């Protein structure tokens, strides 16, 4: 017992007073070291959790909460935290709890003033409480905390509502929580999968309603650029598209949702956007298309889709910087007629760079004489390895002055592509019919 509960309570009052200078990381390391003693840890945490629940004269601490409102953090009449100060008391307590997760208090507190895995249930209930449920910051911190601890039905419902309602880092911590919980028990796996599916079906139903408004307004726009207001609730960063896609990416991460009324009307909507002679107008359905190809094309219907929307899926991919062979649309690598030339060229150049990404590439000299370049290159290079060829070649012409290596390389390559078709090497000969093309010379055995 290094410290008693009054000295710990005096330290814990520091979590309420919001002073920027105060080193709260040092205070967290003090509480962490004190919390190596199991009974101290347990009392500290039970007090911090009572502070969160109570957030949802020496103790006369006036915090500026809003304009013209300087609240007293403590109301003593049984000790309450004035709800204006609460979000800061919550923020400091969740900041401390994140460190304790990496590794009575009120009655003591008034006595002054007159002078991991079990409480996970409380922290999952905490998501329901309004000061937290409002604040994206407190939600992100609490989710980070749960994501650390994770290493019942309502508590998972409250974790999932964090996805069906509104934080990309906080929702990736929610993905970590929901996975690592499902790793725990097959029964929590099952209940969280089926309740994700329930939420994804709600999101899908209202997304089909929204796309139905979009399609109707595109009909009413044409039958007499696209800034249909029905588009706004799809453009939104917090659109049901992004909620639906997030939930499906978690579902598919748990797999290791029947909606043809959505998918066929996404269909006719895409077809009516493409027929409406606007191009980026498709992109307001890109995440619904990526969801379609997530639910379908499991690690056919997606092939008929990529055919009937071929030029549309190409507009999608061409606009997207998502690298074709790391995103969801990688499956279509093998059905290649469904992509544009320059899409396939980009895929080529990036996947080639992916395979050779382990190679450090150097610069490498090639010393040639202007009158023999072809045979000098053959001698220098024809025994070089492919990875040495993959080095950037710079060409030095004997005794010539220095010049720009890029222009000199382009010239050198041009000269080579000419010398290739000199009959003196007997490598290539013109088609006797066309007389401008070239094929392998059957007289190269000379």
């Amino acid at each position: 017992l290094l410290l008693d509960h009054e000295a710990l309570s005096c330290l814990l009052v520091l979590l309420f007073v919001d002073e920027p200078k105060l080193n709260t990381s040092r205070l967290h390391r003090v509480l962490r070291n004190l919390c190596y003693h199991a009974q101290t840890r347990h009392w500290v945490i039970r007090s911090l959790l009572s502070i969160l629940q109570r957030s949802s004269s020496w103790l006369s601490v006036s915090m500026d909460a809003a304009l013209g409102c300087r609240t007293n953090i403590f109301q003593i009449q049984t000790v309450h935290i004035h709800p204006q100060a609460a979000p800061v008391v919550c923020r400091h307590v969740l900041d401390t709890l994140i460190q304790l997760a990496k590794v009575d208090f009120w009655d003591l507190l008034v006595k002054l003033d007159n002078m991991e895995a079990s409480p996970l249930g409380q922290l999952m209930n905490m998501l329901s409480h309004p000061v937290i449920r409002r604040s994206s910051l407190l939600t992100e911190k609490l989710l980070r905390l749960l994501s650390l601890i994770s290493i019942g039905l309502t508590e998972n419902q409250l974790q999932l509502s964090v996805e069906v309602l509104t934080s990309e880092e906080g929702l990736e911590d929610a993905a970590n929580v929901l996975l690592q919980l499902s790793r725990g028990d097959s029964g929590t796996r099952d209940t969280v999968l089926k309740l994700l599916l329930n939420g994804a079906r709600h999101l899908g139903y209202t997304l089909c309603k929204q796309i139905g408004t979009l399609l109707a307004e595109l009909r009413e726009y044409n039958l007499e650029e696209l800034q249909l207001p029905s588009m706004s609730m799809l453009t939104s960063k917090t659109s049901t598209q992004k909620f639906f896609l997030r939930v499906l990416q978690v579902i598919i991460q748990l797999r290791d949702l029947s909606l043809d009324e959505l998918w066929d009307m996404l269909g006719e909507c895409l077809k009516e956007l493409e027929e409406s002679h606007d191009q980026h107008a498709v992109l307001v359905l890109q995440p619904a298309v990526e969801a379609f190809f997530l639910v379908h094309a499991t690690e056919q219907k997606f092939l008929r889709f990529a055919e009937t929307h071929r030029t549309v899926l190409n507009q999608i991919l061409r606009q997207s910087t998502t690298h074709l062979a790391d995103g969801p649309f990688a499956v279509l690598v093998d059905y290649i007629r469904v992509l544009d030339f320059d899409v396939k060229r980009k895929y080529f150049r990036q996947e080639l760079e992916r395979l050779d990404e382990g190679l450090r590439k150097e610069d490498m000299a090639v010393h040639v004489r202007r009158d023999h370049v072809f045979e000098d290159s053959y001698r220098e290079l024809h025994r070089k390895s492919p990875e040495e060829m993959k080095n950037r070649l710079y060409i030095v012409f004997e005794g010539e002055e220095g010049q720009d290596a890029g222009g000199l390389l382009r010239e050198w390559y041009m000269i080579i592509s000419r010398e290739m078709f000199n009959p003196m090497y007997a490598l290539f000969r013109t088609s006797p019919g066309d007389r401008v093309t070239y094929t392998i010379n059957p007289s190269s055995h000379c």
Partner: protein
Amino acid sequence: LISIFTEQELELLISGLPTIDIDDLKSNTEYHKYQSNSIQIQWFWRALRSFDQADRAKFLQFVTGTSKVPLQGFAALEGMNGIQKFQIHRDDRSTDRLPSAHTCFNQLDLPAYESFEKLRHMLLLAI
């Protein structure tokens, strides 16, 4: 990884997309049974103008057998028997068959397709 390209696209990848002076091609077009003011020909020029650079190059390769543009212009377009201009022939067979090419004559046989949309679809599927 190279097998993602077509036989056209590998040529266009190695030698690059050419810039086609459609006015030079039109200036070096021969109409045999179509005429320069036939509606299918106005559709042809509208279609080929509407095709992007890659589908234009794929057409030139389809009908001439190469993407190579003659330096002097299509007036210097070579064929089997000396300089042969580009040429469009009306294919008097049924118009439910694709256009057909004889690249050594730089020759296009083109059925009298009934509409711009259908002609464009058939040409785009051929190229």
